[PDB]
Every structure is written in C-alpha cells, then in structure tokens.
Ligand SMILES: CN(C)c1ccc(C(=O)NCCCCCCC(=O)NO)cc1
Ligand SMILES: [K+]
C-alpha cells in the first residue's frame with residue numbers, strides 16, 4: 001500500500017517555530033507538494049504526544065521541568081528553554097509515534113516524518129537542540145509488533161541518544177555513520193563503541209572524516225548494512241536521514257549529495273520491511289528540502305524533474321533553480337586504509353550477533 005506522509009497545517013506551523021531551523025518544515029513540505037508527490041502518498045494528521053506517551057522513555061521529572069520552563073536537565077547553550085518548547089516537543093514526539101502506529105496496523109510499509117529525528121535527547125536531559133527523543137518513542141511503539149528493530153542514523157552527528165536508550169538490549173540494534181573528530185559533538189561513537197551488557201555488539205558505529213562523498217559513503221554503508229541484515233535479521237527499520245551531510249551545509253563537514261544518500265535508502269527499502277523515515281539536522285534550508293524531496297521521490301520510485309517548480313519558496317533556490325546539488329571541492333580526508341580498518345572491526349563485532 002502507499003507510503004504514509006505525516007502532515008497537517010498545524011504541525012508544520014509548530015515545527016516552523018524551531019529556532020535553529022526556522023521555516024524549514026514549510027520549505028520541505030511545499031517542495032514535496034510542488035513536485036506533486038503528496039498526491040501519491042497517504043496524508044495522516046499526527047497526534048500530539050501525551051505526558052504518559054513521552055514518559056515511556058523520558059523521566060517524569062524531566063518532562064515536568066520541560067513543561068514548566070516552557071510555561072514562562074541539559075537546557076543550556078544548545079538547548080535553551082524558550083517559550084512553548086514543551087508543545088513543539090510533544091508535537092514531534094506525537095508525529096513519530098503516529099508514524100509508528102501506522103506501521104503497526106499495516107496501514108503502510110513506509111511512514112514519513114521529515115520533522116522528526118531528534119536523536120541526541122536522553123531520558124532525563126535535552127542535548128544538541130533535541131528536547132525529546134522522538135526516534136526512541138517510535139522504536140518503543142514499533143516494539144509492540146516487531147521483535148527486532150534496526151535503527152540506522154545517517155545524520156552527520158552520532159545518534160547517541162538512541163544508542164544510549166538501547167545500549168543494554170539486543171532487541172534493538174543501532175547503526176550510526178557520523179563524523180568522529182576531536183572536538184566534534186557529541187564526541188561519542190568510535191568504532192570501538194559496541195554497546196554494553198546484554199547489548200554488547202548490538203550498537204555499530206562508523207567514525208568518518210571530513211570530505212566524504214557519495215561513492216565511498218555508499219560503499220561503507222552497503223558493506224555495513226549487508227552484514228547487519230545477515231546477522232541481526234531485523235523485522236522493522238527506523239531510518240534517520242539528517243541532511244547536514246549534504247554539500248553546502250554550514251556544518252561544512254561531509255561532501256555528500258542526495259543521490260548517495262538515496263542509494264543507502266534504496267538498499268534499505270529493498271528489504272521490504274516496515275520502515276519509519278525521519279529527518280534530523282540540515283542547516284542549508286533549501287538544500288535540506290532538495291534532499292528530502294529527492295528522497296521522497298526515491299521512496300515512491302519516481303524520477304523528479306531537475307527544474308525546481310514555482311512555489312512559495314522558489315526564490316530560495318536561486319541563482320540556478322535546480323534540484324541537484326554539486327559536491328564542493330573540499331578534500332576527502334578519508335584514507336582508504338583507515339576505512340578498511342573500520343569495516344574490518346565491524347565485520348568482526350557482528351560475528352557475535354547470532355539470533
Ligand atoms: C566557540 N563556542 C563558544 C562554541 C564552540 C562549539 C559549539 C558546538 O559545536 N556545539 C554543538 C552544536 C550541536 C550540534 C548537534 C546538532 C545536529 O545537527 N545534530 O544532529 C558551540 C559553541
Ligand atoms: K549518524
């Protein structure tokens with residue numbers, strides 16, 4: 001059946017308020033609409049997460065504080081307590097939950113929430129602009145139906161909050177590809193990070209250096225997810241597709257285009273598992289929309305016109321007004337020997353995973 005697209009006017013207005021990515025949610029949706037892709041999906045209005053829904057992961061003390069400061073726990077430079085942040089958080093939490101529920105009822109095989117992917121938040125602390133971990137909330141919901149969940153995080157940053165939540169269990173494997181460099185947030189996720197306790201070997205991390213491009217990135221991601229699929233035999237997938245890897249992002253780290261990320265998405269989609277799709281970082285707002293629109297076409301098996309259609313944010317796509325993103329000339333700092341070393345470490349780790 002058709003992919004579920006989580007959307008409502010009210011939800012977009014709320015997400016548009018997020019101080020770090022103002023109007024991004026509108027840019028993404030309206031570009032998707034301009035390409036007419038919403039006509040090929042099923043539109044589902046997200047529900048707002050309740051206190052008890054949020055507490056399936058977050059502590060009651062954290063949530064009540066979140067609510068309080070919202071009225072007027074890690075809430076500093078990166079997570080300042082501004083007005084209404086509790087409600088924005090509940091909205092995005094509720095949207096990802098709703099996408100998880102759609103997948104449970106076999107309503108669809110793919111459900112999309114581009115405004116989710118808040119991977120840094122911990123049970124009792126905001127972190128890295130994330131005030132609530134919607135991905136954790138969605139994974140926990142999927143656990144009602146699906147015995148083993150694979151979480152793949154292709155954001156520029158290590159998916160630490162989701163990894164930490166599931167660090168001690170073998171029911172959820174987390175796989176993050178990310179920049180790993182001294183001084184680079186959040187600082188965790190070296191290849192030696194494999195989880196803890198009964199969850200040992202059920203976290204995978206691929207530390208990557210600046211300048212990686214589509215070919216090498218896909219080679220890495222394919223080699224890893226092939227071994228992971230073979231060992232772990234997931235029954236459902238949650239996929240975080242933060243677009244702060246894309247050439248032209250203020251993070252100025254990776255040198256990806258949406259085509260490379262699309263090949264990673266295609267590879268996952270061929271498994272034909274229930275797959276919950278999330279956004280994440282993405283700070284060149286027009287490139288982020290270009291990326292997730294392209295990825296939405298990949299999901300629908302549609303090839304999109306190169307020319308950006310006229311729509312509300314048309315002027316954001318000047319001077320060239322095309323959907324494709326050109327790589328920068330920044331050096332690729334990934335030595336082939338080091339990448340091979342990393343992949344061999346992971347190959348080894350995954351031999352312990354036996355279902
Ligand atoms: C000089 N100075 C005072 C500072 C230096 C570095 C940071 C920083 O990197 N902070 C981390 C920003 C959060 C990054 C995570 C966002 C994301 O895209 N996650 O996926 C801040 C201030
Ligand atoms: K990541």
Ligand SMILES: [K+]
Nearest residue numbers: 166169172202
């Ligand atoms: K785990």
Ligand SMILES: [Mn+2]
Nearest residue numbers: 155156157281
């Ligand atoms: Mn990021």
